[model samples]
Target: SIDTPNYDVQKHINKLCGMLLITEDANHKFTGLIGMLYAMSRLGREDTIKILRDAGYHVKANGVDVTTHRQDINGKEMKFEVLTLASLTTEIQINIEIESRKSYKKMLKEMGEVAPEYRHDSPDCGMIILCIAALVITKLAAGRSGLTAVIRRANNVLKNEMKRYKGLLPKDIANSFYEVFEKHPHFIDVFVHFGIAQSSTGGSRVEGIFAGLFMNAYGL
Candidate 1:
C-alpha cells in the first residue's frame, strides 16, 4: 500500500520531518539518534549509516543491536539479535515492535521468577535509574528543608545517570522501584508525591491524597 507514488513521497518526507522534530526536542534527546536512523532508512542503507554517525551513534558495520532473544527458530532454539536501522532488512516498524514485545515477554518471565519484586509488565530503564538515584539522595538528605531541595538533588542524580542502558540489570532495577513505592506508601510520600509538589502548587494536596490510587492504577 505504501508503494503508491504519492504515498512514497509523503511518507518519506513525513518520517524525515518527524525525526528532525525528535532530534530538536530536549526531552527526547537520548533517543534522537535512533529516530534519525528510522527516517534515514528510506534514503538507503548508505545514508542511513551517515545519519547514524551524524547523530553520534558511531559503531561498526553490523549496526546497533536493539534487542536480543533466545528463542525457538524452525524446530530448534537459537540466540538472535534485532539490529537496525543501518542494515535494515525489513520495515523499521516491525523491528521496533519486535523489540517492544521482546521486552514485554522477557519482563513477564522475570516477574514470575522473581516473585513480587517486580510490579509492572514492561520495565522502564530510565525510571528505574531515576528511582534509585532518588532513593539514595533521599536517604542522604534524610532531613530535607523543603520539597525544592529534594527536586534539585533528584535532578542532579538523574543528570549523572543519564550518561549510562536497557540491559537486564537496568530493567529489573527500574521495575523494583515500582514494587517499593507501591508496596510502601511512605516512600511515595517522600519521592513521587513530594517531588511533584514544589514544582506545582495546590493540586499536590489533592493528587497526594490519591497517590496510592494513582500508583496502583498505572503500575504498568
Candidate 2:
C-alpha cells in the first residue's frame, strides 16, 4: 500500500546527522535540510514515485502543499516552510522543511540580490537557501537508487564535463560524500548494490522522460 511506513523522525534524523560526518556546530542544521530534501525527493516527485512503484511499493498521485511558519530555537526565532505530501494511507504525510543557522555570513550575500534586509534577520534564511539547493540536487538525483549512486553519477558527469577544471572543483565535494557513506556503512552498502545494478543496466529513463516533459511544458 502507498501508506507511510512506520519510522521514527528523531531516529532517522539522528542517523542522517551521523552520516554527515561534519564537525561544525551548524552541521546538524545542514543535515536536517538534506534529510528533508532526501525524503521529499523520494516521496513527492514522480520519478521517485515510479521507483517506489517498481520496488513494489504502491504509490499514487497525491496533492502537495507549501506552508510557512516560524520557531524559537536557542533563543532565536527561525522561520521556515514545509512542503507536505499526503499518501493514501493514514499517518503517511511527509514534511519537508528547513531551519536557519543564525551565525552564517555567506547567507547574507546570497540573499542580498533578492532582499537587501537578508543579513539583518536570523540564520534560517541561509538555511532555507541550503535547503533549496539540497532539494534541487536531490530532485535532480531522485530517480536514482540512492545517495551514493547520485553522488557517483553526478561526480562522473562533473569529471567529464569539467575535465579541464579538475583543479577548480573542490576536493572536499567528493570527500564530504565519501564521509557520509563511511558514517552510514549499512545504508551505503545497500545503495552501493543498488547503484551497481542501476549502473550495470543504464541510468534512470525517468530522468530523460521528465526532461522532455519539462521542456514541453515550458514550450522549450
Candidate 3:
C-alpha cells in the first residue's frame, strides 16, 4: 500500500508529464505507467478500479487483467497474447521501484543538465514544472479527485525538498521548462508514440521538434 498515500493523483500525473517532457525516453513512460498502476493498486478505491477496467484492464483483489491485444498504427490487428500477466506485473513493479529509489537522483541529474551550479541551491524549476504538468495531465485522464490525491502525495515530498523555494523562480530555468511543457502537453501520449516510432526513418525526432515548435508558437 505504498501507493495509497493520501495524495492527489492529478498533481502526480502532471508532475510525471512534466518529468516526461524534460526527460524524453522510452523508459520514462514505463516509469510513469508503473507509478500510476501501483498507486491505483494501493488505493484499491472503486473509482480507481473502474478507470483501469474501462481502459481494457481489470483488477480483482488477487490480480490484474490487462488486455492481450492492441491495434497497430496502421490499423492492423496485432496479437499481443505473447505478453503475460506476470511479466506485465513484474515490469510494472521494476519500473515503480526503480523510480522510487532513483527519484531524487533523477531529479538532480535533470537539474544538473539544466543548470549544474544551481543543482544544490534549490529545487530546479524544471522539476517543479514537470510536477505541475504531471498533475494537469493526470487530472485530464483520471478526473479531478484522483489527480488531487496524487498531488497531495507529491506535495509531501516536495514540501520537504522543494516547497521552500516554491514562489522563487530562476528566470532561465523557468523559461526552459515552460518551453518544454508548452510543446508537449500530451506527455504520456508522446512518450508512448516515441517508442513506437523509434524504428522508423523520421521517427521520434518529431517529438522534440514538435515540442520546440509548440513552445515557439506559444512564445513560451
State which candidate has the highest lDDT: 3
RMSD of 2: 12.7
Overall local distance difference test of candidate 1? 0.34
Worst 10 residues of 3 by lDDT: 1-10
lDDT of each: 0.34, 0.33, 0.35
- lDDT score of model 2? 0.33
Tens digits of per-residue lDDT for model 2, 1-220: 2222122232333222222321122333233234333443333344445555565544554544444455665698866533343421111111112212222233444444323222223212222222222322343334432445434544443342222211112233434334443453332323323233333332333233223322332243
Candidate 1 local lDDT, 78-185, one digit each (tens):
554434334234344343434444554665665554222232221222232334424433433454223444345434544433322222232233334444444433
Model 3's lDDT to the true fold?
0.35
The deviation in Å at residue 170 for candidate 2 is 12
User: Which candidate number would show the highest TM-score if scored against the true structure?
Assistant: 2
Query: What is residue 73's positional error in candidate 3, in angstroms?
Result: 37
In candidate 1, list every pair of residues with a backbone clash: 128-174
Which has the better TM-score: candidate 2, or candidate 3? 2
Off by over 4 Å in 2: 1-23, 28-44, 59-64, 73-78, 85-100, 105-220
Question: Residue 13 lDDT in model 3?
Answer: 33
